[PDB]
């Protein structure tokens, strides 16, 4: 696997994707440890495959029992870690895959005040530079579902309104004739 | 495959099938041969050399441990040739690896039988002893014993056929040749052996001559009689023997092949011309016609050797006649009647006429007092023939150029101690000397030292011949300069970059050219160069015709010649400028100031003045502060007048006036430094991008802060040093101690020397001078990003979601958005910033006309308008088409909207109008200037449109506020305001 | 840098530079103590590399401080003179004919004595850096150079007297008192120096007593008049008039 042949690595990670719904936690864990080095691979295909299996892990390990062991929690933490880190992967479609994974209504709450509290769940200091961009992008994705979003911001055109010139000798004249 | 090639080589010598691995080993040898012969890999050369010259495994033990096999014979031969090429590859740095080669050579010769291996090994031994003529391992060579060993083979001489014995006789020569103190007790016996050998092997009248053993004994006697003088005084028997041997070796026989044996004879004579001559002067006509026919055939090296031997023969004959006056009249009269021979005829070939003109011009010392009649006839026919053969009959562009250096040296050799040539052929002479100058760059490297030698020889011949004829050298160098300025602007083409070595070898290389021709020459050549450059400055009528709008010169041939002149004078002037340039700085500088007064915008004369006053500061001309104070008070007024006409310049013209002004001497600067501090300010503001401007600024600052008095320089440090700041300031940044403390428990010259020079100048400037770098210049451009643009926040945008809908304020984004839309240097960030600013200006216009009920009115956006309208005008004239596409009709629509006022000075309208009027008066742009001209036309058209005629007849309120501003702009002292 | 022969800081730095926690933390901020240690161990090329890294780090952590924090970038800018004097000393000592002549050393001493820090603007830590480094350099040059000793020992004394002057000038009377009584042993050997020593002691006791009481003032300015005449007064003060 770690010998770089991206055609061979693609079919290898595809085998990994196929067999992992029947692995048990310890072997899934010790196999997932050499998975997570494919962030630095230059192929979009192998990073796509790695994000597929990490999304599968994140949906298969969201607290599966009442209490889970050390290995199940560690698997889920490593998966959510690299799947946070996949928000900044240098690809304009793969980043869209990851952001549509995260913005889905069972991952971040669609409600705004719940979402703002839940955005700090996806921090992970291995990324922090793009974090504010991710935060405002997640916060402002939630406004296209609005009754005021198709409406114009102002009602009339300018040709039907007035022209307020403010011909007062108030304290506006203070700041206007001290200045220019 | 290196080192394993030699490993497989060391495996395949004990083969089960004999000569079964020999061919594969030969291919291994060719593999390493292809690796190392045409090689440039610098690192592996030492290791491959160590393996080839080892004891463990490689070529030397591969050739030593293959003597006990005939199947590896040609293995020895092939690595012998490869190691000859390999030792020829690297020079004196294969020093400690030659004793192995030495004993290798004697063993592969001593214990072998075939001729083919013993030719190149012995060749290699002679070659390495030639390779080290200055070493110390020739003591590790048992040299005096090896002569005895190769004389033992002479004692057991059983007829080894020709070429092995040829290399034997060359090594027998060259052991006596180099490292010479170890054979002198057998000198006359080896002399006798080689002479009786050539006699028996040459005069044998039963058989024909075997010519390769003749060439071997010829080269052997040659290298034997190197450094082995035995004159006609000491012993003339050996002298007449070797004379008649070398002058019977060059008999012209028809159907003669192998064009190397008489070249061995002529190399013998060209090495031994001054060795034996008394019997050489009895066959005068025979030697002359034999060599005149024998330099004439179609080979190469025999022609070179016979020609050089012929000329040194002539040199020694001329010397033995120029001992005295009238007793070698025999040799004189025959050489006169024999050099009547070739000068009249048509078999020129530019070599036999070349030697005839050279010798028969040289024969003037023994001629001058005995004839004195044909002496002036010499040097009439010579350059007459030069006129007829290559002046009008143009054959340049082929192989007929390569002789004029020796031609000029021959005519100078007849020309030195001569009388005058009155009127006719002398501008023809100066003409042909500058032709030899001009047909220069078609050459090969390392013959220019003979070409410039010819030029200094003919200049010495012309300078000695009257004060009237010393004028003519000035015409030579002036016609040369006006020839060399005729070149393109940056079989091939030249430019001014090529003759720089000729001018350097003229003006810096005389003390090697006057101590052999039997300081006071480049003095004259320097005055000639300065006079030529000045008289060329006075000619070129460099008024650029108007089409800096679209100025192109009327004679564009003049301008390229001018800039070739100034760019040449750059490199050629300051070398050897100690006491020859300094008495003329006043006249040269005066004329350049005088021409620069009439030609300001040329950017060539300031570079000249920079070089001149730089050489004056080299020669400390302004330290007595006559013609010196005139130069001082001239440059004071010229600098004070050039610093006031350089607000106008903006191209390299600006940089050239700056490099002139900062190259002033400090005693010009220290009497009014306030007049040049704007030059240092502009040079530092320009020196960010243009790096040599900062370089000359830093040199100027280390001049001023050293030599200007402390208490006078001081009150100008607080605007020189503040603009020295952007040089220090240029992912986010690096990591520091408070991050590493918590972190180790969890896990031209470049800009980059200008920064080091600025820090070094801040360090060496002091501490009591240093702190003015923080002193604020104005603070109005410091705090322009830190004033808040408002007091009350406007633009309360409400972000709609479903149920929250919070309020956001877009005033926080406006400085960042405007600075990111004007100054972006990134495509996507620019287009996103431009789209955001377009929506934001729509938001500003919408919010300003919304009608609230809770206060009394909409918030006045005037303070934001006054800082967003210059951005919005500079974005509608950007060089990018898309930004100009969406921001120009926005500008026009804004001019249509904000011109609806009916009070006199609505502040929003006045903000727009004053933004347009600071657009017009901006003294950098042109696009913004005429675009705000467009905007003012729109302003009046839509002030006169958005109103009725009678109320505009009653009270015009945007036109009158326009005209009141145009009037105060027309009466302004600033010139660009009156232009606006 | 003024003797004492201790191999403690060198060994601390030595086995600190073997890890990364410490070898990383040194050559970002300090690096100048590193230069002045590797100079003192005569590992001169490493001192050159570390002083070039020091000049680089100055611009590194100078451009990072904001425009408004005027005092902090002033505190950075106050280090650049001592940061470059070491560079000048390395450049001087690398050249070869400077160690046979006298005029390049006299040129260097003249540049050093016209370039003092700012009295009444540079605090005494900066002054201590400059003068202690220059005294270390003169000791090192007198070692590696074989008149000479008098022209450097007049320079070191004039440097210490200029520091005492600029420390008296900014109400730092304790350090001025300490440096003044530090020189009392070797200021005796030539009465030219003894006059300047008692004169600066008189100025220090005058300016020191602009503040202390009025009962104490008359007692402690009175100490100078019996201390004042101890030399052969009509020898040197009749020779020199200044």
From Swiss-Prot, chain A:
<protein>
    <recommendedName>
        <fullName>DNA-dependent protein kinase catalytic subunit</fullName>
    </recommendedName>
</protein>
<feature type="modified residue" description="Phosphothreonine">
    <location>
        <position position="112"/>
    </location>
</feature>
<comment type="similarity">
    <text>Belongs to the PI3/PI4-kinase family.</text>
</comment>
<comment type="function">
    <text>Serine/threonine-protein kinase that acts as a molecular sensor for DNA damage. Involved in DNA non-homologous end joining (NHEJ) required for double-strand break (DSB) repair and V(D)J recombination. Must be bound to DNA to express its catalytic properties. Promotes processing of hairpin DNA structures in V(D)J recombination by activation of the hairpin endonuclease artemis (DCLRE1C). Recruited by XRCC5 and XRCC6 to DNA ends and is required to (1) protect and align broken ends of DNA, thereby preventing their degradation, (2) and sequester the DSB for repair by NHEJ.</text>
</comment>
<comment type="subunit">
    <text>DNA-PK is a heterotrimer of PRKDC and the Ku dimer (composed of XRCC6/Ku70 and XRCC5/Ku86). Formation of this complex may be promoted by interaction with ILF3. Component of the core long-range non-homologous end joining (NHEJ) complex (also named DNA-PK complex) composed of PRKDC, LIG4, XRCC4, XRCC6/Ku70, XRCC5/Ku86 and NHEJ1/XLF. Additional component of the NHEJ complex includes PAXX. Following autophosphorylation, PRKDC dissociates from DNA. Interacts with DNA-PKcs-interacting protein (KIP) with the region upstream the kinase domain.</text>
</comment>
Curated annotation (Swiss-Prot), chain B:
<feature type="modified residue" description="N6-acetyllysine">
    <location>
        <position position="111"/>
    </location>
</feature>
<comment type="similarity">
    <text>Belongs to the PI3/PI4-kinase family.</text>
</comment>
<feature type="modified residue" description="Phosphoserine">
    <location>
        <position position="968"/>
    </location>
</feature>
<comment type="subunit">
    <text>DNA-PK is a heterotrimer of PRKDC and the Ku dimer (composed of XRCC6/Ku70 and XRCC5/Ku86). Formation of this complex may be promoted by interaction with ILF3. Component of the core long-range non-homologous end joining (NHEJ) complex (also named DNA-PK complex) composed of PRKDC, LIG4, XRCC4, XRCC6/Ku70, XRCC5/Ku86 and NHEJ1/XLF. Additional component of the NHEJ complex includes PAXX. Following autophosphorylation, PRKDC dissociates from DNA. Interacts with DNA-PKcs-interacting protein (KIP) with the region upstream the kinase domain.</text>
</comment>
<protein>
    <recommendedName>
        <fullName>DNA-dependent protein kinase catalytic subunit</fullName>
    </recommendedName>
</protein>
<comment type="function">
    <text>Serine/threonine-protein kinase that acts as a molecular sensor for DNA damage. Involved in DNA non-homologous end joining (NHEJ) required for double-strand break (DSB) repair and V(D)J recombination. Must be bound to DNA to express its catalytic properties. Promotes processing of hairpin DNA structures in V(D)J recombination by activation of the hairpin endonuclease artemis (DCLRE1C). Recruited by XRCC5 and XRCC6 to DNA ends and is required to (1) protect and align broken ends of DNA, thereby preventing their degradation, (2) and sequester the DSB for repair by NHEJ.</text>
</comment>
<feature type="repeat" description="HEAT 1">
    <location>
        <begin position="282"/>
        <end position="317"/>
    </location>
</feature>
<feature type="modified residue" description="Phosphoserine">
    <location>
        <position position="796"/>
    </location>
</feature>
<feature type="repeat" description="HEAT 2">
    <location>
        <begin position="907"/>
        <end position="943"/>
    </location>
</feature>
């Amino acid at each position: 696997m770690r010998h770089r042949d991206d055609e061979r690595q693609k079919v290898c990670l595809d085998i990994i994707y196929k067999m992992m719904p029947k692995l048990k936690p310890v072997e899934l864990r010790e196999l997932l440890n050499p998975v997570v080095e494919f962030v630095s691979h230059p192929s979009t295909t192998c990073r796509e495959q790695m994000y597929n299996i990490l999304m599968w892990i994140h949906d298969n390990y969201r607290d599966p029992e009442s209490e889970t062991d050390n290995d199940s929690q560690e698997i889920f933490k490593l998966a959510k870690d690299v799947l946070i880190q996949g928000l900044i992967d240098e690809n304009p479609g793969l980043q869209l895959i990851i952001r549509n994974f995260w913005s889905h209504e069972t991952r971040l709450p669609s409600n705004t005040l719940d979402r703002l509290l839940a955005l700090n769940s996806l921090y992970s200091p291995k990324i922090e530079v793009h974090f504010l961009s991710l935060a405002t992008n997640f916060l402002l994705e939630m406004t296209s579902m609005s009754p005021d979003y198709p409406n114009p911001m102002f009602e009339h055109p300018l040709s039907e309104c007035e022209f307020q010139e403010y011909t007062i000798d108030s304290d506006w004249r203070f700041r206007s004739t001290v200045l220019t | 495959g290196v080192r394993c090639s030699l490993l497989r080589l060391q495996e395949t010598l004990s083969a089960a099938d004999r000569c079964g691995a020999a061919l594969a080993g030969h291919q291994l040898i060719r593999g390493l041969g292809q690796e190392c012969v045409l090689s440039s890999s610098p690192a592996v050369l030492a290791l491959q050399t160590s393996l080839v010259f080892s004891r463990d495994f490689g070529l030397l033990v591969f050739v030593r441990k293959s003597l006990n096999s005939i199947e590896f014979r040609e293995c020895r031969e092939e690595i012998l040739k490869f190691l000859c090429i390999f030792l020829e590859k690297m020079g004196q740095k294969i020093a400690p690896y030659s004793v192995e080669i030495k004993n290798t050579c004697t063993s592969v010769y001593t214990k072998d039988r075939a001729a083919k291996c013993k030719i190149p090994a012995l060749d290699l031994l002679i070659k390495l002893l030639q390779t080290f003529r200055s070493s110390r391992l020739m003591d590790e060579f048992k040299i005096g014993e090896l002569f005895s060993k190769f004389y033992g083979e002479l004692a057991l001489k059983k007829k080894i056929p020709d070429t092995v014995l040829e290399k034997v006789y060359e090594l027998l020569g060259l052991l006596g040749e180099v490292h010479p103190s170890e054979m002198i007790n057998n000198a006359e016996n080896l002399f006798r052996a080689f002479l009786g050998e050539l006699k028996t092997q040459m005069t044998s009248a039963v058989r024909e001559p075997k010519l390769p053993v003749l060439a071997g004994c010829l080269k052997g006697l040659s290298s034997l009689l190197c450094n082995f003088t035995k004159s006609m005084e000491e012993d003339p028997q050996t002298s007449r023997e070797i004379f008649n041997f070398v002058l019977k070796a060059i008999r012209p026989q028809i159907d003669l092949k192998r064009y190397a044996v008489p070249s061995a004879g002529l190399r013998l004579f060209a090495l031994h011309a001054s060795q034996f001559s008394t019997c050489l002067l009895d066959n005068y006509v025979s030697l002359f016609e034999v060599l005149l026919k024998w330099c004439a055939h179609t080979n190469v090296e025999l022609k070179k050797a016979a020609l050089s031997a012929l000329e040194s023969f002539l040199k020694q004959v001329s010397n033995m006649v120029a001992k005295n006056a009238e007793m070698h009249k025999n040799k004189l009269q025959y050489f006169m009647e024999q050099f009547y021979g070739i000068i009249r005829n048509v078999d020129s070939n530019n070599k036999e006429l070349s030697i005839a003109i050279r010798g028969y011009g040289l024969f003037a010392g023994p001629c001058k007092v005995i004839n004195a009649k044909d002496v002036d006839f010499m040097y009439v026919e010579l350059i007459q023939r030069c006129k007829q053969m290559f002046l009008t009959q143009t054959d340049t562009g082929d192989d007929r150029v390569y002789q004029m250096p020796s031609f000029l040296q021959s005519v100078a050799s007849v020309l030195l101690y001569l009388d005058t040539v009155p009127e006719v052929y002398t501008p023809v002479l100066e003409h042909l000397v500058v032709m030899q100058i001009d047909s220069f760059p078609q050459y090969s490297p390392k013959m220019q030292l003979v070409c410039c030698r010819a030029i200094v020889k003919v200049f010495l011949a012309l300078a000695a011949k009257g004060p009237v004829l010393r004028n003519c050298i000035s015409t030579v160098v002036h016609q040369g300069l006006i020839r060399i300025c005729s070149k393109p602007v940056v079989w091939k083409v030249p430019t001014y970059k090529d003759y720089v070595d000729l001018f350097r070898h003229l003006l810096s290389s005389d003390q090697m050219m006057d101590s052999i021709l039997a300081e006071s020459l480049n003095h004259l050549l320097y005055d000639e160069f300065v006079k030529s450059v000045l008289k060329i400055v006075e000619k070129l009528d460099l008024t650029l015709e108007i089409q800096a709008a679209n100025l192109h010169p009327a004679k564009p041939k003049d301008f390229s010649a001018f800039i070739n002149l100034v760019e040449f004078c750059r490199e050629i002037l300051p070398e050897k400028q100690a006491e020859f340039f300094e008495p003329w700085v006043y006249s040269f500088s005066y004329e350049l100031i005088l021409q620069s007064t009439r030609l300001p915008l040329i950017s060539g004369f300031y570079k000249l003045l920079s070089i001149t006053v730089r050489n004056a500061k080299k020669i400390k001309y302004f330290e007595g502060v006559p013609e010196k104070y005139s130069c001082f008070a001239l440059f004071v007024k010229f600098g004070k007048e050039v610093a006031v006409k350089m607000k106008q310049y903006k191209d390299e013209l600006l940089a050239s006036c700056l490099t002139f002004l900062l190259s002033l001497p400090h005693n010009i600067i220290e009497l009014d430094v306030r007049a040049y501090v704007p030059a240092l300010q502009m040079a530092f503001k320009l020196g960010l991008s243009y790096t040599p401007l900062a370089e000359v600024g830093l040199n100027a600052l280390e001049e001023w802060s050293i030599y200007i008095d402390r208490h006078v320089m001081q009150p100008y440090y607080k605007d020189i040093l503040p603009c020295l700041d952007g040089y220090l300031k240029t992912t986010k940044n690096n990591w520091e101690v408070s991050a590493l403390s918590r972190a180790a428990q969890k896990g031209a010259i470049s800009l980059e020397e200008i920064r080091i020079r600025v820090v070094q100048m801040l360090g060496s400037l002091g501490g009591q001078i240093n702190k003015n770098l923080l002193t604020v210049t104005s603070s109005d451009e410091m705090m322009k990003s830190y004033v808040a643009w408002d007091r009350e926040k406007r633009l309360s945008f409400a972000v709609p979601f479903r149920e929250m809908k919070p309020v956001i304020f877009l005033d926080v984004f406006l400085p960042r958005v405007t600075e990111l839309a004007l100054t972006a240097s990134d495509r996507q960030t620019k287009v996103a910033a431009c789209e955001l600013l377009h929506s934001m200006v729509m938001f500003m216009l919408g919010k300003a006309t919304q009608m609230p009920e809770g206060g009394q009115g909409a918030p006045p956006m005037y303070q934001l308008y006054k800082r967003t309208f210059p951005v919005l005008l500079r974005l509608a004239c950007d060089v990018d088409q898309v930004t100009r596409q969406l921001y120009e009709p926005l500008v026009m629509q804004l001019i249509h909207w904000f011109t609806n006022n009916k009070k006199f000075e609505s502040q929003d309208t006045v903000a727009l109008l004053e933004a347009i009027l600071d657009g017009i008066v901006d003294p950098v742009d042109s696009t913004l200037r005429d675009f705000c001209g467009r905007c003012i036309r729109e302003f009046l058209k839509w002030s006169i449109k958005q109103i009725t005629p009678q109320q505009q007849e009653k009270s015009p309120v945007n036109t009158k506020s326009l005209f009141k501003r145009l009037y105060s702009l027309a009466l302004h002292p600033n010139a660009f305001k009156r232009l606006g | 840098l003024q003797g004492e022969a201790d191999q403690s800081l060198l060994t601390f730095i030595d086995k600190a530079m073997h890890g990364e926690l410490q070898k990383a933390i040194l050559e970002l901020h300090y690096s100048q103590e590193l230069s002045l240690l590797y100079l003192l161990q005569d590992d001169v090329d490493r001192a050159k590399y570390y002083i070039q890294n020091g000049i680089q780090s100055f611009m590194q952590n100078y451009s990072s401080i904001d425009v408004l924090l005027h005092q902090s970038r002033l505190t950075k800018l106050q280090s650049v003179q001592a940061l470059t004097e070491i560079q000048e000393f390395i450049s001087f000592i690398s050249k070869q004919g400077n160690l046979s002549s006298q005029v390049p050393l006299k040129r260097l001493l003249n540049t050093w004595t016209n370039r003092y820090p700012d009295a009444k603007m540079d605090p005494m830590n900066i002054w201590d850096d400059i003068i202690t480094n220059r005294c270390f350099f003169l000791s090192k040059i007198e070692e590696k150079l074989t008149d000479i000793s008098s022209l450097i020992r007049s320079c070191k004394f004039s440097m210490k007297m200029k520091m005492i002057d600029s420390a008296r000038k900014q109400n730092n009377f304790s350090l001025a008192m300490k440096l003044l009584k530090e020189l009392h042993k070797e200021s005796k050997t030539r009465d030219d120096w003894l006059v300047s020593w008692v004169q600066s002691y008189c100025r220090l006791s005058h300016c020191r007593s602009r503040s202390q009481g009025c009962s104490e003032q008359v007692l402690t300015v009175l100490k100078t008049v019996s201390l004042l005449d101890e030399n052969n007064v009509s020898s040197y003060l009749s020779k020199n008039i200044l």
